[PDB]
Amino acid sequence: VTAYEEIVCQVFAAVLDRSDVTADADFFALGGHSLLSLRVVARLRALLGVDVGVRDLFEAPTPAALAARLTRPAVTRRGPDAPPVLSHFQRRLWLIEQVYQTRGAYNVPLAVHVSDRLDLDVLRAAVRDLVARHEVLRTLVRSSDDGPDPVLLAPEDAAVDVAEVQAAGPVADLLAELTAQPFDLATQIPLRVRMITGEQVDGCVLLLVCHHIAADEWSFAPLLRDLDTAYRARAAGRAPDWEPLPAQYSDYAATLHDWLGEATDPASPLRRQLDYWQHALQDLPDELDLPTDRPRPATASHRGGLARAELPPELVEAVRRLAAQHGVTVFMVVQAAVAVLLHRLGAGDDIPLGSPVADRADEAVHDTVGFFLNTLVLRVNLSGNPTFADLLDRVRAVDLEAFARADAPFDAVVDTVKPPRAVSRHPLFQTMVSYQRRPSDVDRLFGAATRLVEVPLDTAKFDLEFAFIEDGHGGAHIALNYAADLFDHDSAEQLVARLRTVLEHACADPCRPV
Ligand SMILES: *P(=O)(O)OCC(C)(C)[C@@H](O)C(=O)NCCC(=O)NCCSCCN
């Protein structure tokens, strides 16, 4: 759970009086000492509601270490002969592709504009190095009577897919097209690389497409970092000089599945967290009464669109200050605003919102390539018509309770709650909200001038997905990924504009009833 880390950083900043704090910043190096540690401890006790002492700050002086400390064995690397192991995340992502024709909805794109057209032969060499380094990028998933089995391809046997694509038409729609092309997870590695060139592009656009089975959005930064390292080494005619990974994805999965235990074991973390969710999701609505343009079709298509809401830097700043002043994360403010929006549209007082939560606290995977996002149902109650400030308190309590049981796999939660099912409706929630932060310092990759370009998706995973996305340097926008079966594009533009309006009012006056 990243939220503990963000709150610690928040406290460091207010106590040390700096706008300086990152996940790796040492409290004592930043000007903290034993006396000031009292104020960190006191504030964290009031915001997180757990026993913290100077003890923990001494042992774990960084926000990353402190957050992981006050919340299970460390990931251990297995032997060189170690067979691959699929995490329950990967098994669920494989299962999604069997239940539905997703049309590429579970591919994740990463697109980088480059001022120089890259060398396709060096690029292919660098991708091979990237795949050799990260086993998850060359792990196939084959079906069997049972379910899926991992198949780890040897580096020599991992046929990478790297190609140049000339752009006649515009590149942004071409990016969406390349992103949606399907992976056969049983025969192709879950990574595709395309270099878009053309008379209308200056340099090239480098497109990495992963299947989510091998990458979440936190994988963008190590993917670009490692690919940049391999590219520049191969351009110089040598293999990259790599510090080996502290852990492969299968190491993480084996450790996690061993600690999780079996659901029939009453002392297992799995059963204990499932029992929490069974009670926390009792009497859940099948779905929220949302204003759609078309009824829910019999078959889900995963066709989608993308509507953006721009946020003035003043608004971004006000939202950060509103979060800091109420002791919540920026995500929590966005989540509360989504709940108010659905509430005002007539969804009721019981608002379940799905949200991805990264399981990346262990230092061995904090910055590695893989899929670590569990999906949690964050159940927001809005009865009693409280203020926005009251709702921020409710949302913090709901989220911290939930984040303490973030390891129960979402598919096991569904199996435990047993909601009424329907293929055209995602179970337990149909609206997701998340907070995302794009990589910083990716401006000078591959010896050129580089910048990320966002890819307009033609797919959607739920009815609605709201993402508060920070670019790598202080900018932010809201992206609404909507199901095209249900919403016209103009309806989605209006929804995401209303979300911004709720945020404007909240920062202006959070003592206003919702
Ligand atoms: P933090 O690590 O920044 O600071 C810890 C301090 C406050 C320095 C703490 O360790 C401390 O005060 N140490 C000094 C303790 C000491 O000297 N005790 C002996 C006093 S002489 C009395 C003999 N009878």
Could you tell me if 8 and 99 lie in one domain? no
Shortest-distance Cα residue to atom 10 of ligand 1? 34
Could you tell me if 236 and 106 lie in one domain? yes
Cα(31)–Cα(17) distance, integer angstroms: 10
**Nearest to residue 176, comparing CAs of 303, 298, 49?**
303
Cα dihedral sign for 277, 279, 280, 284? positive
Please give the distance, rounded to the nearest whole angstrom, from the Cα atom of residue 175 to the centre of ligand 1.
Answer: 62
Could you tell me if 12 and 147 lie in one domain? no
Could you tell me if 65 and 101 lie in one domain? no
Q: Quick check: 355 and 375 in contact, CB under 8 A?
A: yes
Please give the distance, rounded to the nearest whole angstrom, from the Cα atom of residue 430 to the centre of ligand 1.
Answer: 57
Could you tell me if 66 and 143 lie in one domain? no
Please give the distance, rounded to the nearest whole angstrom, from the Cα atom of residue 9 to the centre of ligand 1.
Answer: 28
**For the CA of 58, the nearest atom of ligand 1:** 2
Which CATH number does the domain housing residue 107 bear? 3.30.559.10
Domain range for residue 118? 88-250
Please give the distance, rounded to the nearest whole angstrom, from the Cα atom of residue 60 to the centre of ligand 1.
Answer: 21
The b/e string for 231-256 (b: 16+ C-beta within 10 A; e otherwise) is bbbbbeeeebeeeebbbbbbbbbbbb
Could you tell me if 48 and 173 lie in one domain? no
Query: Any residues with Cβ below 6 Å from ligand 1, and which?
Result: 33-34
Could you tell me if 60 and 93 lie in one domain? no
Could you tell me if 134 and 194 lie in one domain? yes
Could you tell me if 143 and 21 lie in one domain? no
Which CATH number does the domain housing residue 50 bear? 1.10.1200.10
**Dihedral, 388, 389, 393, 395 alpha carbons, nearest 10:** 30
The residues that bridge with 505 in the sheet, in sequence order, are none
**Which residues does the annotation place in the binding site for (R)-4'-phosphopantetheine?**
34
Please choose from 27, 28, 34 the residue to mutate so as to test ligand 1's pocket, defined by most ligand atoms within 8 A of CB.
Answer: 34
Total number of residues shown for the chain? 514
Cα(62)–Cα(75) distance, integer angstroms: 19
How far, CA to CA in Å, does 473 sit from each of 5, 410, 437?
Answer: 19, 32, 9
Cα(298)–Cα(295) distance, integer angstroms: 9
Could you tell me if 60 and 115 lie in one domain? no
**Which residues does the annotation place in the binding site?**
34
Could you tell me if 26 and 149 lie in one domain? no
Could you tell me if 57 and 159 lie in one domain? no
The structure was resolved to a resolution in Å of 1.9
Phi, psi of 48 (to 5 degrees): -95, -15
Method: X-ray
Please give the distance, rounded to the nearest whole angstrom, from the Cα atom of residue 43 to the centre of ligand 1.
Answer: 24
